[PDB]
From a paper:
The Commander complex, a 16-protein assembly, plays multiple roles in cell homeostasis, cell cycle and immune response. The complex regulates cell signaling by modulating trafficking of transmembrane channel proteins and receptors to the cell surface and diverting them from lysosomal degradation. We report the structure of the endogenous human Commander complex determined by cryogenic-electron microscopy (cryo-EM) and comprehensively map the molecular context and interactions of the Commander and individual complex interactions in human cells using affinity purification with mass spectrometry (AP–MS) and proximity labeling biotin identification (BioID).
The CCDCs form a long heterodimeric coiled coil with three flexible corners and three major coil regions that we call the I-coil, R-coil and V-coil. Two high-confidence crosslinking–mass spectrometry (XL–MS) crosslinks between Lys373 of CCDC22 and Lys352 of CCDC93 (I-coil) as well as Lys598 of CCDC22 and Lys601 of CCDC93 (V-coil) support our atomic model. In the complete model, the Cα–Cα distance between the last residue of the CCDC22 NN–CH and the first residue of α8 is 23 Å, a distance that accommodates the 12 residues in the linker between them. The binding site is composed of two interaction surfaces, with a hydrophobic groove between the CCDC93/22 coil and the corresponding hydrophobic patch on the NTD (or lobe) of [name] comprising the main site, and another mediated by electrostatic interactions via Glu19, Asp21, Glu25 and Arg40 of [name]. The putative Rab binding site of [name] is occupied by I-coil. The inherent flexibility of this region, however, may enable binding of Rabs in another conformation.
Numbering used by the authors:
A (entry chain O): 1 to 38, 459 to 963
B (entry chain M): 1 to 357
C (entry chain L): 1 to 108, 320 to 627
D (entry chain K): 309 to 426, 446 to 631
E (entry chain N): 1 to 182
Write the structure that this text describes.
Amino acid sequence: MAVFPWHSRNRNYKAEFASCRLEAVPLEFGDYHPLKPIFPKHLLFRSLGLNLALADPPESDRLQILNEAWKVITKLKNPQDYINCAEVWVEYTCKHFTKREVNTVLADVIKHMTPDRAFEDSYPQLQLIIKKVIAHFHDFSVLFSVEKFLPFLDMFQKESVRVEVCKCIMDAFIKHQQEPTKDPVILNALLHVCKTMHDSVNALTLEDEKRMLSYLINGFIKMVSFGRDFEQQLSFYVESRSMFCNLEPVLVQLIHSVNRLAMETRKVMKGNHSRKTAAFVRACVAYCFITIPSLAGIFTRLNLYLHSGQVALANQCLSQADAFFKAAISLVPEVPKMINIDGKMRPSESFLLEFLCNFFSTLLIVPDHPEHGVLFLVRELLNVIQDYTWEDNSDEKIRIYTCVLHLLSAMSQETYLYHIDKVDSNDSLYGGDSKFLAENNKLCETVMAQILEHLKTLAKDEALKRQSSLGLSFFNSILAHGDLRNNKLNQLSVNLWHLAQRHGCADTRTMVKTLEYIKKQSKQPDMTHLTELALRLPLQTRT
Amino acid sequence: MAAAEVADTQLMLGVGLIEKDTNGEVLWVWCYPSTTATLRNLLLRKCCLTDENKLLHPFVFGQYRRTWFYITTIEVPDSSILKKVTHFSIVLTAKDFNPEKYAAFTRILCRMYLKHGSPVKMMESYIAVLTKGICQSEENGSFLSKDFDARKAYLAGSIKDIVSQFGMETVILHTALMLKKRIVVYHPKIEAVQEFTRTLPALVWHRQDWTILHSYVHLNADELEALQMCTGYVAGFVDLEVSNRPDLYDVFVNLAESEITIAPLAKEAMAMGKLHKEMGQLIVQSAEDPEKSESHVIQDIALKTREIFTNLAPFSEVSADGEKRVLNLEALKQKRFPPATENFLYHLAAAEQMLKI
Amino acid sequence: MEEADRILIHSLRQAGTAVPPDVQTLRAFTTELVVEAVVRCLRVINPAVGSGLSPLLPLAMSARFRLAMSLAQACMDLGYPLELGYQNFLYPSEPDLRDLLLFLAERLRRPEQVTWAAQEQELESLREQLEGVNRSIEEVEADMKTLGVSFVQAESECRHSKLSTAEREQALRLKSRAVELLPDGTANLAKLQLVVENSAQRVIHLAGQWEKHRVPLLAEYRHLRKLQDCRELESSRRLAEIQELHQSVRAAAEEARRKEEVYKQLMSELETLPRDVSRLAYTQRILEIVGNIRKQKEEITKILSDTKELQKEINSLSGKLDRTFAVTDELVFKDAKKDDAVRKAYKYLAALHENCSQLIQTIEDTGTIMREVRDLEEQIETELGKKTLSNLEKIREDYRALRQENAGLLGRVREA
Amino acid sequence: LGTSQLHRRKVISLNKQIAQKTKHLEELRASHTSLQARYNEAKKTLTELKTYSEKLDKEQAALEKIESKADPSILQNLRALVAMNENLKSQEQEFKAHCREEMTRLQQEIENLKAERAAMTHDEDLDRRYNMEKEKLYKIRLLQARRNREIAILHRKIDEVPSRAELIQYQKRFIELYRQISAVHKETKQFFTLYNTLDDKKVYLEKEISLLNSIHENFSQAMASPAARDQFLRQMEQIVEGIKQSRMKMEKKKQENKMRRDQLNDQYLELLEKQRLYFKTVKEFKEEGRKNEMLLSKVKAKAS
Amino acid sequence: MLVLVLGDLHIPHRCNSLPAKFKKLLVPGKIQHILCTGNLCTKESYDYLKTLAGDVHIVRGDFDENLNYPEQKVVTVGQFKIGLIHGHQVIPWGDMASLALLQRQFDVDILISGHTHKFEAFEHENKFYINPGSATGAYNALETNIIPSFVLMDIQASTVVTYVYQLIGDDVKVERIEYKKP
């Protein structure tokens, strides 16, 4: 058996669709389905605050009492009594009357607290006050109108305390904020607080606190929205990136946002892509591009890379994609033997292969460079993959080899499994270049060489179950992609099937049902040479 | 005995066959009777295999212009016949009733052919029955016409089952039946039609005429004409369209329904007056009264038949034509039968062909 | 901020201001260079003012002030957030200039009764005969009806009679036949039975012949049907094939037209396009920077560890030190009780550990002071970025010139 | 003279109707007569058949008379056999005829299937056409690939020099990047200083504990004798002397760095005050400009 | 038995709410099982699902940060084994031949994909294969538009009745098949 060149089945995915598809009936107007929906002053002051909170005369009388009580309180220089009793009366005051009534209290609070550190001793009281505000106040714009809150913030010093306030404030904001819109002032204040949080961060702070804080930030972030203003949105993002360096996941959100903006902009333009559209496109591209390096989560960064890729594919940026691929490639060696997630170490190779899998498909979707060697990139990636220190259970390598042949098969196709928009691929140029086809086949054969080598090595290795599965796949693939009109390859497929059976660690049930499937497929007319195979395939069995 | 076998071996005018080949088509394949190419086309129209599986009813029996015909289809079951045969439909043609005995001799013929493939040996069996009214089989225990008197074929019908199914619809059926009136039966299952309809000559059978049983009539003009040759008639059908036609039918039975239909004048001639109440009573008992089997029910219907015949009998004179009587129907009305009994007497004297005009 | 220096290049290119050779930094500039840029900036962006002041450099110093005041106004065109004016417009720190420049770059007894009777009589005479004729006609019609029925009746009886006659003929013939057979009944019976059975054998013969004749006909039929279908399928397939290939070829020609015309567009585009420094170059630069970030971040990260372990080492040391001194000082005092000079050694114990604390503290202080040094040096950097002394020299000579100028102006006010 | 036209008119109508109806009578009567003869004829024929039938009946009675002379069983068997042979002759002869008949029929049917066939040349020419289409399609695909090559070349050429718009994001990135550069690196080296600090703290913790334990034991040994105890007093004064020398070296460093710090800080403050002077002098000049322009207003009004 | 199957919600980045009438169609409780092929992305989206019905299963797609979701699962309802994948595992995305390869690996009667981004529902080899599409209509990079689509099916022993929901503005279109276990 020489280096017998693989040659492929030909398939009309459209005809295959029409055969395999079930045609569902469009269901009738309003028809059934299972979920069709067919004695000091302050002491009495506070005591009175309790009684009034419980029971009170009419609002006008409450107002009178407010004036009298708070006036005396302003006269009351003693800050501790002042803060203690005011905290109780505040709830009742905000409960009945509008903002300004309390705003007076705010002013006098600022006055009494300002001259002396004791307000820092009163930090809890300040917190409870704001929490009470939270319960009673819910529309942001009024708080912005209730500008006293800014002096309130300014009064503080203790970063931590402030941060606590921020957490509470923003969670309440989230509970209230359900409107995806904008207000520059609203943004300004929020952003200021956000930076307060961000700068509060240090390298030393607990990652969990970091995470939660970030996540909250992230929530409002999702809420941030100015509708149809790609450039404003963009810029805001840029600076956001600038400041909010303190946690990457957060930044990924921005990344995602970029993507969303870009893609939707693309869709609404409907191919009617002006200079503006394409520049905007490229800018999203870059911003994103530059981001990943800044990032850390390599695996994540990789899928991010491929998204970057595909959007560039969506956006006509070939060599750009190439760069990203080079990057992915560069990350490939980076992938360590074990990676830690959830605090725990897991065999990454499984995961990276999963990526690789979707990437490979992604491969053929690319239009290549004429200058660059026709899919050289592909080989580089695979070769490097093999260069990784794969231990035993390399067989996953072999899985990829298999699948790579499936890809090679698509390249072999004079027409590809899908064709995307304006996207071009070597098919779209070459229309079945015999030369390209042959070179591809040669590449396949290279893989097939590796296939034979390791499989029989595994035979030397008594890895009869794993090797057996590998042969299982090999024959399966040959079936999907091949023509037994290479009688030689058909026979080698028999060699496989019985070789697997002669070592015998394979599931004989698998093999039996497999053979049954072989005959069931073989039944079709072209499959008569598969019928020749399936009968010419007897089967040695554990049974 | 033997005279009946010689008659029957005239009547059994021979075998039909149709099949299908692998080139793509169902086909007639040769066999052994006195052919009639027109009637041959008619039988082809009988052929269930003509629709490869509309309902590939595996057996049919039939009668045409008093000539009976008998049919088997098994597509192709496991046998050593020529594998070109994709489908098969064996038939015979007759003037005689023993569908079961035909089923036997045919099963003999068929299995013999299923071993050999040759129809000519099976024709040897045709010849054997021809010569003897009997056949041995290599494939089977032997068959004798002595095995299966026609009255055995007549016993097979359960009248109880039908009358328990049809109640006063059976009073409709009765009043059409006795008076020589045009009876239609519809069920899409030819098997059920065959069973029910062949039971229908059993009803009143002592008033013997078995030739009536044309178990498969087509709506073709020639076939409808042939049924027109009949007057008291029962023809079987598997589609509703015959219900359209009380002009054509005195009764439409949907056996798919368990329903029986009254023709326009029959709505008086079969109106529930005195005799038809008597019949309502008798048929309620024929469901309900257990004492008497189907043939015994025929005996008690023969009691009613002798009642009506003897009502006619002294009131009627026996003509110079000798065979039959001429009825003073005016004197029968002077008897003053309550109106439905007197009407049934008149209509049966028509059915007896014993009128005076 | 050399990347920003590349933005300078960018800004110069967009403005159409040159990049003279050493004009690679803000450091190079004179005020005119910038303020010219500002002229370009609004003259692009707000020409209404921006047309106002030529890129021609002024020399009326008052015009320098006032044109510069127009620059402040140009900021007032939107309000770049910082302070404005000729003071700035004289030669500020490069950060400031850079920032503002960026702000710019972005937005880019009467006769009848006697005789009439005899006349109408003529009607009546015919009317009666008419009715009588009609009577006779109806009569004959009835006769024809009855006779036709009777005729058909006779026809029916004739048909049945014929039937009976035929039956009699057959029965009579058979009876004669039986009479013919009467003399040799047994022998005739056996002979005839044998004859019948042989004739049936002869029938069997013909059935075999006719069978065997029959089979070839069917086999040929089958053959012709099979070739019929094969032809029909074949034709259908070639037809479908060529339909599809034609349609695809059509689409390919359409695309060829589109491609060719676009290609010439691309020719025009090649004609148009500039040849600047590439996307790649900045890509590389960024990545370099990226690496920088990674490396020093990672170095900080090692340092994070180093701190962690170093402190826990110090912790262990502190515990061992405290317990060490407790045990040691206890024993030393126990010994000191013996003798005044042992007490002197104990004195040296306490004083030594004190001096240890002293030195440690001094080291701490040194660290703090050197942190101060960092701060001060940063501030120095700040002020030299303020070009601070040179800007002294600038404002001294400027204010000198303008004080002198204003004194001349006062003189002219009094003179003129 | 009393006379009517209706007499005339309807008289003529009546004569026409009489005559016409009478002729209808004559024809109908003739038909009656013809059918009468016809019917009577049928009757005669019927009588004729009856008479012949009666002769047949006479003949049957006589033939039955002859038959009576022997065993009816034997006669019946013979008759049956006669009918049997008769039937055999009939179906066999008929069947011969049908053999020939059906042979001819199939012969004719096959003659149909032959003349039906006695698309292929079409199929060949279709193959040729098909091949031609594929062939020009391949050459077309050649042009596609080539044009596409140009497409990619020109695209890359466009894009290699990104849009000023693109540069926008570029530089702001750079800007944060510088910010980071600085922030990070300064953080970094300051924490390196922190390292120096904790490093030195650990070093002297170690040296302190070690010397402490050593001197503790040397005390324990020395105190045993007054002479060695006093020797420990002197040697420890020497050790504390070296320690104090380390203290004094650190203090000297403190003072030197303090001097540097003082000098630079003072220069800093000098420069601060001077920078304030320069902004003041900035204001002074702007005052000089305001004065200048006021004087200019005066000067232009006065002199001009 | 009422069971809900979904994939590739892309909630935070692409699809931070489900649309109105589709949400509305999610009545809680009249669903027995919930199966997600992945890229629903968030634990809180899963919370919304688990509150839609408790019997949730999720296989790991791309963006689902809970890597602890299995790559695949064989779920079983009625009389059918039912294979679960994020089609990011599917070699030529969508190859029927590969799909049967999967079936023969796992001997399952049904399979559901999600990563593929057409509406897909092929049964051939007497084995059935599904793409609901993204029920949030998360953009298909290969494609110009996808309406969000989702299916519930009446799985009844050896038989399954499909309900193929499509939201078209206020138009919730639905299609039915019955799949069976011959």
